[PDB]
């Protein structure tokens, strides 16, 4: 078997992993508190894929889910601790050749700097947030 390539990014509450298998079959996703296992048959050659990810920080497997589309399989993991920083996806620091950051959906979400406050749309959100103070 071989790992599927994948991309990832996160947000304050969730971690997102996209397994880039087109025309996937028999997709099996196992969400455990400290581990994610992906298993998939797929592509034109029915190649068997396997990705065992020992996670950086624990998640809530009961608020985790995935959606299969013809283009890719997207997994959404719930962070065990909201606001937790995830500098890397895995527990170990070795680079995995098949894993990369999904820069197109990357956001520096952990950034509350005093950018122009308005920015009306950003502003309105912040006024609605301050409205709850």
């Amino acid at each position: 078997m071989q790992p599927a390539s994948a991309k990832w990014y996160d947000r304050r509450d969730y971690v997102f992993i996209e397994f880039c298998v087109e025309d996937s079959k028999d997709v099996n996703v196992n969400f455990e508190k400290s581990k994610l296992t992906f298993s998939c048959l797929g592509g034109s050659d029915n190649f068997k894929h396997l990705n065992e990810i020992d996670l950086f920080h624990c998640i809530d497997p009961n608020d985790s889910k995935h959606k299969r589309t013809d283009r890719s399989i997207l997994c959404c993991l719930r962070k065990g601790e909201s606001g937790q920083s995830w500098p890397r996806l895995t527990k170990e620091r070795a680079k995995l050749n098949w894993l990369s950051v999904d820069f197109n959906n990357w956001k520096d979400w952990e950034d509350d700097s005093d950018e122009d406050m308005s920015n009306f749309d950003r502003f309105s959100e912040m006024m609605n947030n301050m409205g709850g103070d």
Binding site: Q2, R88, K95, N97, V101, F103, W106
Partner: protein
């Protein structure tokens, strides 16, 4: 219902055209594409040889050759890298978006220390930006030597080669278009390589016919050193790197070497030069000197987004293993990335300056060249004002010729000082001998001298330091620690001179906002100070000379002038007596105007209609001479 399913297709003819005509804007980049492919080929063979040394039996030297030929318009590039088998030659050069490099990396076992350039699959074809035809000769350890050939006409051919054996490797021959022949010039080749591909791990040699013999010049002599652990690099090594990077002759003054880990990762080297260049802020077109590289290939340089202008004197390199590059590989898709890099670069520069500041002699050298950049940063960077202010140095009334920090000032404050006092002006001597500090000096209070035009913008944003407010000694309302007896005496003086304050105001009309009795003068009869907010005399004269200014606003914005009287001066006392005796005495009127104008000049204000002033002086002279 019935639903038909189809696979996606592509039109090869148009696809080939788009690659050639719409993907790349700079024709010369074809050279870096070919060089990059070569460095990958070399890494592949090097990697394999790690577990199987027989892989290099076919040749052990890993290098790149460039051989222009003006006698037959071609340019040949030669590798000793892994090469291609017939099957690979067909699938990889044969398929528009196929990347063998990408597949190889995916196949590799982690954590092999391999970093290759080449995830798109499209780039070989950039050869046709300048070439009419391309011929590729290859030899792989597991196969026969073969020749591939194409004019990008929708087809290509493969034949078994008959030429000299290469052992292992590739040869790429570009048959150039007749109108793209500058690429055969030694000068042009050197410029291209130096700009885009000098930090490549394999040596690149340029072969040039001269009078005959062929010269052989290595181009990439400098190694990237930023890839090394910072603790293993000596200053001499940093210095040599610096010099070849910047074409200096002088060494560097200071350097940081650091890395950032996380979802977005990078390494960087930042150098502070020993002399400010001479064009800072005047060049206008050139903004920063930080170059950005990805897996040591140059991507961009004159990017405003990486560094705030106030740090436009830092020379340096940023190198990242993984960034979201554009198809042309000349820019990034996500501008949000630059913002992060910038936050980190600024933070580290400030750490460097702080560290540098511990070395008093080197700091002095630094400050003398870049104090304007610090002050500018205070004006513009609201996030770091707190830290930047500790890097400031000023001459003070108690420092002689040393420049001292604000903390140093603070350590000498008297117990009853609540304020840090300062004066601004044109020169050190104009301020030092100014009337405005006569009492402060008498009482032993230290005053900071700020004498650069930029200081007006800077001090405006400081307001306080470590809880002590800053006070301008040229503004109204100056307060000194004071005794009770002195305060009582001042009130008596204010009372007895009330009549001059009124009379003088009536004489001056709109030339002054008010006339008051001074508490800051000792020997000068009077001075002019400004209101608490906004402009001071120096800000005013500066604004008036900025040339690209809105003239219509200068009709509203002006310093508000207040005249202060020294109650103990002999001129003032005889004036009081005369003025009370006769409110309309011509002598009084003329003296008041003369004192006003004199004060106005000594207080730093431009005098309107100086000819009138001069004429008064001339009359005094004529009188003295008996004319």
């Amino acid at each position: 219902e019935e639903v038909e399913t189809f696979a996606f297709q592509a039109e090869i003819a148009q696809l080939m055209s788009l690659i050639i005509n719409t993907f790349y804007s700079n024709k010369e980049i074809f050279l870096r594409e070919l060089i990059s492919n070569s460095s990958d080929a070399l890494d592949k063979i090097r990697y394999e040889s790690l577990t199987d040394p027989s892989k290099l039996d076919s040749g052990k030297e890993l290098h790149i050759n460039l051989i222009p030929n003006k006698q037959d318009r071609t340019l040949t590039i030669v590798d000793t890298g892994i090469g291609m088998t017939k099957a690979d030659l067909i699938n990889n050069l044969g398929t528009i978006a196929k990347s063998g490099t990408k597949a190889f990396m995916e196949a590799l076992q982690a954590g092999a220390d391999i970093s290759m350039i080449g995830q798109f699959g499209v780039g070989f074809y950039s050869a046709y930006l300048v070439a009419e035809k391309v011929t590729v000769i290859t030899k792989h350890n597991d196969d026969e030597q073969y020749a591939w050939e194409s004019s990008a006409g929708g087809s290509f051919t493969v034949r078994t080669d008959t030429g000299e054996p290469m052992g292992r490797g590739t040869k790429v021959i570009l048959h150039l278009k007749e109108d793209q022949t500058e690429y055969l010039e030694e000068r042009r080749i050197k410029e291209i390589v130096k700009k885009h591909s000098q930090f490549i791990g394999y040596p690149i040699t340029l072969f040039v016919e001269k009078e005959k013999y062929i010269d052989q010049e290595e181009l990439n002599k400098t190694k990237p050193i930023w890839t090394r652990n910072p603790d293993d690099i000596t200053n001499e090594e940093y210095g040599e790197f610096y010099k070849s990077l910047t074409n200096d002759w002088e060494d560097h003054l200071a350097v940081k070497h650091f890395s950032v880990e996380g979802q977005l990762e990078f390494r960087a080297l930042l150098f502070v030069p020993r002399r400010a260049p001479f064009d800072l802020f005047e060049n206008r077109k050139k903004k920063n000197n930080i170059k950005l590289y990805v897996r040591r290939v140059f991507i961009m340089d004159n990017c405003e987004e990486l560094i705030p202008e106030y740090l436009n004197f830092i020379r340096g390199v940023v190198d990242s293993e993984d960034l979201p590059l554009n198809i042309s590989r000349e820019m990034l898709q996500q501008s949000k990335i630059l913002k992060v890099i910038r936050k980190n670069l600024v933070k580290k520069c400030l750490e460097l300056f702080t560290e540098l500041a511990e070395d008093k002699e080197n700091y002095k050298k630094f400050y003398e060249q870049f104090s304007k950049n610090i002050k500018l940063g205070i004006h513009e960077d609201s996030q770091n004002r707190k830290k930047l202010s500790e890097l400031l140095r000023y001459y003070t009334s108690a420092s002689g010729d040393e420049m001292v920090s604000l903390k140093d000032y603070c350590t000498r404050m008297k117990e009853n000082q609540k304020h840090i006092y300062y004066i601004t002006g044109e020169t050190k001597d104009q301020v030092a001998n100014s009337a405005f500090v006569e009492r402060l000096r008498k009482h032993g209070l230290e005053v900071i001298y700020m004498i650069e035009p930029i200081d007006e913008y800077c001090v405006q944003q400081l307001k306080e330091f470590e809880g002590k407010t800053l006070v301008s000694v040229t503004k109204e309302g100056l307060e000194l620690p004071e005794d009770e007896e002195e305060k009582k005496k001042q009130e008596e003086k204010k009372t007895k001179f009330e009549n001059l304050c009124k009379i003088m105001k009536d004489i001056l009309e709109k030339k002054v906002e008010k006339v008051v009795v001074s508490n800051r003068l000792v020997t000068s009869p009077c001075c002019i100070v400004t209101s608490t907010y906004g402009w001071t005399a120096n800000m005013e004269r500066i604004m008036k000379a900025q040339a690209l200014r809105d003239n219509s606003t200068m009709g509203y914005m002006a310093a508000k002038k207040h005249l202060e009287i020294n109650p103990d001066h002999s001129i003032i006392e005889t004036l009081r007596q005369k003025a009370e005796a006769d409110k309309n005495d011509k002598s009084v009127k003329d003296l008041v105007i003369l004192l006003y104008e004199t004060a106005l000049l000594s207080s730093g204000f431009s005098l309107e209609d100086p000819q009138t002033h001069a004429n008064r002086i001339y009359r005094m002279i004529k009188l003295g001479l008996g004319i």
